[PDB]
Design an enzyme around this catalytic site. Structure first.
Site, PDB file in Angstrom:
ATOM      1  N   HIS B  41       0.806  -1.221   0.000  1.00 26.62           N
ATOM      2  CA  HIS B  41       0.000   0.000   0.000  1.00 26.62           C
ATOM      3  C   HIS B  41       0.842   1.276   0.000  1.00 26.62           C
ATOM      4  O   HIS B  41       0.274   2.367   0.149  1.00 26.62           O
ATOM      5  CB  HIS B  41      -0.960   0.003   1.192  1.00 26.62           C
ATOM      6  CG  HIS B  41      -0.279   0.120   2.519  1.00 26.62           C
ATOM      7  ND1 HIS B  41       0.089  -0.979   3.265  1.00 26.62           N
ATOM      8  CD2 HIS B  41       0.107   1.205   3.230  1.00 26.62           C
ATOM      9  CE1 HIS B  41       0.666  -0.576   4.382  1.00 26.62           C
ATOM     10  NE2 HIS B  41       0.693   0.745   4.384  1.00 26.62           N
ATOM     11  N   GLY B 142       3.424   5.760  10.028  1.00 23.38           N
ATOM     12  CA  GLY B 142       4.762   5.574   9.518  1.00 23.38           C
ATOM     13  C   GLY B 142       5.454   4.314   9.991  1.00 23.38           C
ATOM     14  O   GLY B 142       6.540   3.997   9.489  1.00 23.38           O
ATOM     15  N   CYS B 144       4.580   1.358   9.386  1.00 23.69           N
ATOM     16  CA  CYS B 144       4.461   0.302   8.392  1.00 23.69           C
ATOM     17  C   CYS B 144       5.840  -0.036   7.837  1.00 23.69           C
ATOM     18  O   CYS B 144       6.652   0.851   7.564  1.00 23.69           O
ATOM     19  CB  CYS B 144       3.522   0.742   7.269  1.00 23.69           C
ATOM     20  SG  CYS B 144       1.782   0.860   7.753  1.00 23.69           S
TER      21      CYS B 144
HETATM   22  C1  V2M Z   1       1.307   2.546   7.989  1.00 24.58           C
HETATM   23  O1  V2M Z   1       2.317   3.351   8.526  1.00 24.58           O
HETATM   24  C2  V2M Z   1       0.935   3.058   6.600  1.00 24.58           C
HETATM   25  O2  V2M Z   1       2.050   3.042   5.753  1.00 24.58           O
HETATM   26  C3  V2M Z   1       0.053   2.635   8.856  1.00 24.58           C
HETATM   27  C4  V2M Z   1       0.332   2.182  10.288  1.00 24.58           C
HETATM   28  C5  V2M Z   1      -0.951   2.620  11.238  1.00 24.58           C
HETATM   29  C6  V2M Z   1      -1.049   3.826  11.288  1.00 24.58           C
HETATM   30  C7  V2M Z   1      -1.591   4.228  12.865  1.00 24.58           C
HETATM   31  N1  V2M Z   1      -1.203   3.309  13.664  1.00 24.58           N
HETATM   32  C8  V2M Z   1      -0.724   2.137  12.766  1.00 24.58           C
HETATM   33  O3  V2M Z   1      -0.291   1.096  13.124  1.00 24.58           O
HETATM   34  N2  V2M Z   1      -0.946   1.786   8.238  1.00 24.58           N
HETATM   35  C9  V2M Z   1      -2.262   2.287   7.879  1.00 24.58           C
HETATM   36  O4  V2M Z   1      -2.562   3.414   8.084  1.00 24.58           O
HETATM   37  C10 V2M Z   1      -3.238   1.318   7.211  1.00 24.58           C
HETATM   38  C11 V2M Z   1      -3.084   1.451   5.698  1.00 24.58           C
HETATM   39  C12 V2M Z   1      -3.732   0.250   5.015  1.00 24.58           C
HETATM   40  C13 V2M Z   1      -2.788  -0.948   5.095  1.00 24.58           C
HETATM   41  C14 V2M Z   1      -4.007   0.589   3.552  1.00 24.58           C
HETATM   42  N3  V2M Z   1      -4.622   1.567   7.567  1.00 24.58           N
HETATM   43  C15 V2M Z   1      -5.155   1.058   8.815  1.00 24.58           C
HETATM   44  O5  V2M Z   1      -4.461   0.448   9.556  1.00 24.58           O
HETATM   45  C16 V2M Z   1      -6.618   1.308   9.164  1.00 24.58           C
HETATM   46  C17 V2M Z   1      -7.521   2.022   8.386  1.00 24.58           C
HETATM   47  C18 V2M Z   1      -8.725   2.010   9.026  1.00 24.58           C
HETATM   48  C19 V2M Z   1     -10.115   2.647   8.647  1.00 24.58           C
HETATM   49  O6  V2M Z   1     -10.233   3.374   7.457  1.00 24.58           O
HETATM   50  C20 V2M Z   1     -11.507   3.895   7.208  1.00 24.58           C
HETATM   51  C21 V2M Z   1     -11.297   2.468   9.563  1.00 24.58           C
HETATM   52  C22 V2M Z   1     -11.143   1.691  10.822  1.00 24.58           C
HETATM   53  C23 V2M Z   1      -9.807   1.088  11.171  1.00 24.58           C
HETATM   54  C24 V2M Z   1      -8.580   1.283  10.203  1.00 24.58           C
HETATM   55  N4  V2M Z   1      -7.278   0.849  10.277  1.00 24.58           N
END
Ligand code: V2M
Ligand code: V2M
Lengths: 301, 292
Positions: B41, B142, B144
């Site tokens: 992603h 960040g 991820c």
């Molecule tokens: C990474 O850093 C993105 O590169 C990020 C890590 C999270 C951010 C906050 N705390 C973490 O661990 N990952 C995300 O933001 C992911 C991206 C996905 C894989 C495309 N998104 C989520 O974890 C997420 C989105 C949502 C949501 O929407 C609408 C609704 C409810 C829960 C949720 N989790």
């Protein structure tokens, strides 16, 4: 975003760990610049003021100093005892030396232990320096020289070097300067430990971490309040330190009180009432492992 | 000495972490041999099966990849999707690559998390893969690209790469093969979390940790005993997994019972009586720090 017992990465400490052998005694040490810091009892088990004579006749080349992480064998040129530690000046300069400071740790604060054996960090865990100047850690034979450390901003802060293990699962040592935490010494004798006192700031912190994560109304969070003066008058006869133990911790306990909407007077009154009941949260509080900074830095504000 | 939560040193993991940036998406990644692994992603927030087209049209050159611990910027020659992970074949081979293995974690197994940001590991903590294929972790934006790992004899075992933070303070991701733990996907949408179930082995080891740490007779301990068969019936209606969850853990559990002189039938019976996150203990980790 989740509240965990965080630790500092050990890679910076790892590349500096060395094994030190003198005669039949072997332990660990850290190799900073051109100096190796190791427990002074690697040359023998002495006591009192007899250390100054053994270091003066210490055979420099009798030290077997190996850095397993870089595959180098170091040669000790001179030996200088600084406190309860040995500063062995070697010919080789450690390339992996980071920006570092020798910083003393205040009781009630947290640090990360790089538990090493034969010059290699095998385990890594988190301890908190208690008011009796002791830590509750996990050390076997050959773990002397393991360092406790923290990281701030591209600088490594060294606070601990292991020496002694007391039989009540407590451990003691010096800083990287050679000064023991508490009145304990690196001697195999009878050593009485100061009376255990609860670091109130960390007991309050551990309570706020439950209120942030339990989500369900705790049956131990009382509905009454007690003031800081009323608590400190009660703390003098109930083995609790003066609250607040640190003015900087209040800034975190204050943010925790507003992010949880539970005043600090509710926690102190609970601490007074919860003395009768729970400690561990097993099934159906009162601990110093959570620090106010670690809880607040992980809490959503 | 004492019984503590033992974590693995992150030195080998640190030297391989890199930073991966694509458009307005920045995350981390691990660099092994001449291949970089990172969540897919980073090229956009997609869903379902359009990943194959979006990766086939993602240039191997909008990728900004740097190893801060080594200060080296890396260029991607080829890009390949493997599951929910991206495989960026770079030109430079990582000289700091240890003997590594892509080993999948099983429910109840503990692992060390290296919380990284912009290719730099910032914090290290310990988690246990829950039965609903979830980890109660601590990640901010960040993070991820962060990995969960274990070490066995100069060999690094990579089990996890963070992807998703759920509603409830639980986190999810994939292994290093690109397969998610549980029925979850890398999509910003409400996902059904499997019903929770207590890993009875790690709950049993939790109680055994107190008997070795504290006294031999706490108050909560029950004087009666319940059988493994009788407990298993009560577990089917009380959200407890079938005991033993892992037959290998019985080697530690039986060694802990004789060490503490309290049978596993009493611990199970106590768990029934005790019914009416934190520091999760595995049976192996407790027994390893127990003397004799
Ligand atoms: C990474 O850093 C993105 O590169 C990020 C890590 C999270 C951010 C906050 N705390 C973490 O661990 N990952 C995300 O933001 C992911 C991206 C996905 C894989 C495309 N998104 C989520 O974890 C997420 C989105 C949502 C949501 O929407 C609408 C609704 C409810 C829960 C949720 N989790
Ligand atoms: C070092 O590895 C020695 O190089 C060793 C580490 C301990 C061993 C077991 N677990 C450890 O953490 N350190 C020691 O053995 C020191 C040696 C001193 C500094 C000379 N001693 C102790 O840890 C110790 C001795 C005694 C004791 O005697 C008498 C009585 C009660 C407790 C105790 N701890």
């Amino acid at each position: 975003a989740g509240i965990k017992i965080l630790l500092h990465p050990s890679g910076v400490v790892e590349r500096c760990m060395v094994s030190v052998v003198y005669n039949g005694s072997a332990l660990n040490g850290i190799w900073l610049k051109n100096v190796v810091y190791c427990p002074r009892h690697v040359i023998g088990k002495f006591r009192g003021d007899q250390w100054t004579h053994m270091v003066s006749i210490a055979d420099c080349r009798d030290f077997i100093v190996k850095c397993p992480i870089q595959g180098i064998q170091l040669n000790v040129q001179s030996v200088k005892m600084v406190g309860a530690l040995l500063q062995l000046t070697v010919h080789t300069n450690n390339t992996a030396t980071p920006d570092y400071k020798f910083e003393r740790l205040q009781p009630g604060s947290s640090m990360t232990i790089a538990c090493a054996y034969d010059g290699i960090v095998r385990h890594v865990y988190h301890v908190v320096l208690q008011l009796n100047n002791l830590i509750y850690a996990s050390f076997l034979n050959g773990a002397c020289g393991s360092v406790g450390y923290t990281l701030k901003g591209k600088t490594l802060y060294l606070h601990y070097m292991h020496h002694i293990e007391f039989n009540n699962k407590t451990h003691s040592g010096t800083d990287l300067e050679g000064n023991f935490y508490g009145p304990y010494v690196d001697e195999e004798v009878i050593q009485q430990q100061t009376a255990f006192q609860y670091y109130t700031d960390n007991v309050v912190a551990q309570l706020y971490a439950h209120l942030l994560t339990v989500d369900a109304r705790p049956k131990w969070l009382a509905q009454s309040q007690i003031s800081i003066e009323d608590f400190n008058s009660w703390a003098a006869n109930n083995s609790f330190a003066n609250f607040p133990c640190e003015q900087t911790n209040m800034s975190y306990i204050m943010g925790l009180s507003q992010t949880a909407r539970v005043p600090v007077e509710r926690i102190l009154n609970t601490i007074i009432q919860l003395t009768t009941n729970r400690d561990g949260a097993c099934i159906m509080d009162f601990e110093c492992d959570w620090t106010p900074e670690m809880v607040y830095n992980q809490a959503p504000i």
